Amino acid sequence: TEDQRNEEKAQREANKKIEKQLQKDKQVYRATHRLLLLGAGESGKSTIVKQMRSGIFETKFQVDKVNFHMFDVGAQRDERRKWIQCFNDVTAIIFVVASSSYNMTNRLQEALKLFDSIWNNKWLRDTSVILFLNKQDLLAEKVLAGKSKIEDYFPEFARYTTPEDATPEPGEDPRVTRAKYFIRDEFLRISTASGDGRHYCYPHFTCSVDTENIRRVFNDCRDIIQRMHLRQYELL
Amino acid sequence: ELDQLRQEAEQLKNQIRDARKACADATLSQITNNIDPVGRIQMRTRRTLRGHLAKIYAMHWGTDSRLLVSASQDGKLIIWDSYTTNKVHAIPLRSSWVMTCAYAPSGNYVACGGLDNICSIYNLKTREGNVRVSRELAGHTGYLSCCRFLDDNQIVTSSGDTTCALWDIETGQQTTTFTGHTGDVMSLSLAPDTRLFVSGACDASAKLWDVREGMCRQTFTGHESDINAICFFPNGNAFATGSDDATCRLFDLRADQELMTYSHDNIICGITSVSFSKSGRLLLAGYDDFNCNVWDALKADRAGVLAGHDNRVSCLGVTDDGMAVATGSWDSFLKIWN
Amino acid sequence: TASIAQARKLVEQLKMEANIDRIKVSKAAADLMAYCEAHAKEDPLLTPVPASENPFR
Amino acid sequence: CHNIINISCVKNNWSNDVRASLYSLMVLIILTTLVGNLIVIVSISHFKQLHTPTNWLIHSMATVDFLLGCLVMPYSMVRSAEHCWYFGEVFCKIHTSTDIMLSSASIWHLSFISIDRYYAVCDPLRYKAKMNILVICVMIFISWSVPAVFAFGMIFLELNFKGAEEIYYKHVHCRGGCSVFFSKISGVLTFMTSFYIPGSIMLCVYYRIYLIAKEQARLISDANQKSKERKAVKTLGIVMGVFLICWCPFFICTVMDPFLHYIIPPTLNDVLIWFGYLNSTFNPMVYAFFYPWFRKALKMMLFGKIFQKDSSRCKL
Amino acid sequence: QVQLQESGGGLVQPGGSLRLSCAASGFTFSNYKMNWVRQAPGKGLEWVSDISQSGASISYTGSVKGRFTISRDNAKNTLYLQMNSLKPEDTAVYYCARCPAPFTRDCFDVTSTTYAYRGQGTQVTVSS
Ligand SMILES: CC[C@@H](C[C@H]1COC(N)=N1)c1ccccc1
């Protein structure tokens, strides 16, 4: 058998080349962090995307030499139980919400329950969630203008008070920030309730435009990874 | 007037149920009781094909039973020579999300697809010597979940937009479209003659379509949750579906009704892939609990297990000659058992 | 609304599925049984073959 | 130490019953070191999941300890239980040289594991990019080699004696055997190369890791409140207390001998040397067995008896 | 065949009381968390309440707690929503839904527009 040996050597040469290319692609892939840009309706997802700068739209931004992917899942139907299982390997699930849409149907309990569903999924028990809350300006403006019926529409708003350990930026009086902080103890309530220690939620109530919006995804993809590493070493 | 038609629909459903009940003189177990058991089935890994970087999600065998193709979430579509473990090809995909894979029966073309809505056809043996997308079939508004060739030209795709399609690759237009489902469509299976094919959906129902005419001939509604897998009986007059109910079920086409159920009280995890052997006496199933199972399709008893994976058996397939069974798992490995 | 058209097509398709010919589940079970019995001799997984003829060894 | 002419090899002033028990204990130590390192070197290579680069340090720190148990320790078992070599002279230097090589390799692999963990929890995004197989294999190679040269060019070339009184050297022999003798310059040089630098790196790298873990525990508790003071205290206490208690006694008593002209009665030598060897015994008990993933993989090895619970059939 | 049928509905003057019964057939009831959602006239589907497998875990939408009482009877394979002290804005088409999978706390798509395991719903009108 000599032609057999010739074919075997040819296949081994092809395998060697393929493995060299795959090693190069692994050196390029291990240094690339995936993400996801879940949009719970018309909640940002159009201006926030431009600060991180026809199905999955894949953008590739680079912060401090790190290579972040980002996957604006769009044109997918509003039935997520099947394709939300494919994003369990991502380091974070950027979840954008319309925090001023509370009293506007409801875009704050079709997105507050979506967070619950993601949290408790058996494949996404490991995937953290970075949680942007767009339109905080609109929320605060409505509250100051008297448009806030969050005392009857979310009637569990009487026992609520601005946390005395608050960090309110100027222009948001104690009463107006009651809204932006009110939609921080709901998602945090869900996170506290379910609980496993394996995945964490990072809330970032901000406006619809800021340069401190890639610096938040970076600063929390750093902490997600620190905690994932401190946990797999039985270190914390 | 809507209720005036709902009443007629209910009456027709009642007629169908009455016909099915009349046609169920006995069950499969009563007629299989006096058959020799298959006994324990011990099969151990024979090859472990390494080289993938992320959770492999699809795979398919060539008609020669030797060449294999696998698709991973890292963007790689690798074509292995399973006999020698060599890699015959490595195709880099445009989209890192590839949910399907298909080796053309002639072996010339390959197909992939995923969350990019597009089915990419790769020509393996261009005169140049490299792999280049022959055509990107577009027109789906969901996500490809399983695509299968009928020939070097035609292809059949199932998408998450609740519809299937029959594409003519030479033009790129959908030769036909199947719109009967009401949930996603998560798998496919072509008849040996390829005149019929069944689609399992997330509405907890399988449907049988005729490729030419293009309308569901029968609907099978025995399940109670999402159907993640489906494959025919080698003779084409029966098939098996696995769901998130944690039960495989063998339906028949000429009886138009469920024939058998494969479940165990100790199993509550979802099924992700089913397959048969060259004879049809062994229904292999791949679960979410890191392992598989091998049911005696006629006794419904667990004839064996295949526990060698780590994360999840995302695809499972037997060769056209039955000489091996390859399981591609989320741990980025294909294990070829026999 | 398109709901009426959807209902009409569903009724038509139920009519199309209800007017097919069926055979007793005993007959279908017997056919599957006969197929498995006839092809059991050609199923390597069911009846393991010698390691000499097993190309994966 | 006051050399003599005719060495008294009958100095084994022990009863057969008690020296046999000492042999039993020492061979128990040998078997533990063999078996643990063999498990951590077979299982880390068999499973394809346990192939991450950080596992190729533990699979190379298990090799050094396995070699130490195989072709080093017994020849010190006999020397300690009988006070008499009984294996010649040319096997002496190539014994107290391979011993130094393998001890330094083990402790250097400890230091490099600490470095890896540092880049794992102080530069997490650029961790898998920078701790690639190339750099980790370079670490393996340097750890394996540099001690090899520093031992076989320092023992064979009788450079430990060099720079020290030969009368005290031949005297420090005390019948010769293989009493390792370190001059002051060589003593401190070995103290630094083998222990002080790896030990200082491990301390300065695990202090930061423990601080980071404590801060992270504080943040998590404060956030999601609606550990033996931590899980970083217990595990790092094991990891560093084992190393300190097992190694520091020997080196502190080895570099302190040349300066004080201490005769170091042989019982102390034996007990401290055997603490040193207990370190190689324990390395896999705290770097591979202590961590679940490894234990679960090993349990999956013994799959002929146990059956998985499939997520324990969890249900609300 | 999964089949959810709702009963109870029709005109109810404000402040009146009603009861919605969901009869579920074609699956094992006691294994799936059951939801009630609603679609107001012209608006989109809006989650109203849930109840877990055993009935121990319950949750309501913001404008409903203390006013609606949800329960389930697994022996009779049935779900119940007692609508007490109705307001005019509570008029809507109420839908009975089941989470897609058994033994899960996640209930992803019950609010979706084309869910498969949701009933045809019943009309609730609140006006004099
Ligand atoms: C015999 C001298 C040896 C000490 C023994 C004790 O335990 C182990 N492993 N080596 C040594 C190592 C490093 C530096 C100096 C000396």
PDB file of C-alpha atoms in Angstrom, chain C residues 3-57:
ATOM      1  CA  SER C   3     -58.208  36.341  12.019  1.00  0.00           C
ATOM      2  CA  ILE C   4     -61.217  35.266   9.946  1.00  0.00           C
ATOM      3  CA  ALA C   5     -58.908  34.199   7.112  1.00  0.00           C
ATOM      4  CA  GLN C   6     -56.732  32.317   9.603  1.00  0.00           C
ATOM      5  CA  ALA C   7     -59.792  30.508  10.959  1.00  0.00           C
ATOM      6  CA  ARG C   8     -60.969  29.678   7.435  1.00  0.00           C
ATOM      7  CA  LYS C   9     -57.593  28.217   6.463  1.00  0.00           C
ATOM      8  CA  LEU C  10     -57.446  26.248   9.719  1.00  0.00           C
ATOM      9  CA  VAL C  11     -60.911  24.791   9.100  1.00  0.00           C
ATOM     10  CA  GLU C  12     -59.949  23.906   5.531  1.00  0.00           C
ATOM     11  CA  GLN C  13     -56.765  22.199   6.711  1.00  0.00           C
ATOM     12  CA  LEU C  14     -58.628  20.238   9.382  1.00  0.00           C
ATOM     13  CA  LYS C  15     -61.016  19.123   6.638  1.00  0.00           C
ATOM     14  CA  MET C  16     -58.011  18.101   4.527  1.00  0.00           C
ATOM     15  CA  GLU C  17     -56.431  16.119   7.378  1.00  0.00           C
ATOM     16  CA  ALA C  18     -59.669  14.456   8.514  1.00  0.00           C
ATOM     17  CA  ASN C  19     -60.403  12.900   5.097  1.00  0.00           C
ATOM     18  CA  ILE C  20     -57.366  10.598   4.806  1.00  0.00           C
ATOM     19  CA  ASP C  21     -57.236   6.812   5.085  1.00  0.00           C
ATOM     20  CA  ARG C  22     -55.963   5.194   8.277  1.00  0.00           C
ATOM     21  CA  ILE C  23     -54.954   1.660   9.240  1.00  0.00           C
ATOM     22  CA  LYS C  24     -55.296  -0.111  12.563  1.00  0.00           C
ATOM     23  CA  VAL C  25     -52.448   0.574  14.984  1.00  0.00           C
ATOM     24  CA  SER C  26     -51.982  -3.193  15.033  1.00  0.00           C
ATOM     25  CA  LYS C  27     -51.115  -3.105  11.320  1.00  0.00           C
ATOM     26  CA  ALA C  28     -48.619  -0.256  11.712  1.00  0.00           C
ATOM     27  CA  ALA C  29     -47.030  -1.932  14.730  1.00  0.00           C
ATOM     28  CA  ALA C  30     -46.761  -5.179  12.766  1.00  0.00           C
ATOM     29  CA  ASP C  31     -45.095  -3.362   9.868  1.00  0.00           C
ATOM     30  CA  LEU C  32     -42.524  -1.730  12.155  1.00  0.00           C
ATOM     31  CA  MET C  33     -41.973  -5.084  13.873  1.00  0.00           C
ATOM     32  CA  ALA C  34     -41.402  -6.833  10.547  1.00  0.00           C
ATOM     33  CA  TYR C  35     -38.992  -4.134   9.379  1.00  0.00           C
ATOM     34  CA  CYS C  36     -36.916  -4.345  12.558  1.00  0.00           C
ATOM     35  CA  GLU C  37     -36.905  -8.151  12.464  1.00  0.00           C
ATOM     36  CA  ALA C  38     -35.833  -8.227   8.810  1.00  0.00           C
ATOM     37  CA  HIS C  39     -33.081  -5.602   9.157  1.00  0.00           C
ATOM     38  CA  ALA C  40     -31.740  -6.637  12.575  1.00  0.00           C
ATOM     39  CA  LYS C  41     -29.033  -8.670  10.825  1.00  0.00           C
ATOM     40  CA  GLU C  42     -27.717  -5.501   9.120  1.00  0.00           C
ATOM     41  CA  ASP C  43     -27.538  -3.171  12.155  1.00  0.00           C
ATOM     42  CA  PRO C  44     -23.972  -3.033  13.547  1.00  0.00           C
ATOM     43  CA  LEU C  45     -25.120  -1.222  16.691  1.00  0.00           C
ATOM     44  CA  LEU C  46     -27.796  -3.825  17.442  1.00  0.00           C
ATOM     45  CA  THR C  47     -25.584  -6.824  16.582  1.00  0.00           C
ATOM     46  CA  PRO C  48     -21.931  -5.850  17.148  1.00  0.00           C
ATOM     47  CA  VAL C  49     -19.589  -6.902  14.350  1.00  0.00           C
ATOM     48  CA  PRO C  50     -16.039  -8.247  14.819  1.00  0.00           C
ATOM     49  CA  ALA C  51     -13.359  -5.677  15.579  1.00  0.00           C
ATOM     50  CA  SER C  52     -11.648  -6.706  12.319  1.00  0.00           C
ATOM     51  CA  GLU C  53     -14.506  -5.377  10.165  1.00  0.00           C
ATOM     52  CA  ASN C  54     -15.182  -2.382  12.449  1.00  0.00           C
ATOM     53  CA  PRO C  55     -13.463   0.493  10.582  1.00  0.00           C
ATOM     54  CA  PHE C  56     -13.404   2.695  13.697  1.00  0.00           C
ATOM     55  CA  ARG C  57     -10.945   0.374  15.476  1.00  0.00           C
TER      56      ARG C  57
END
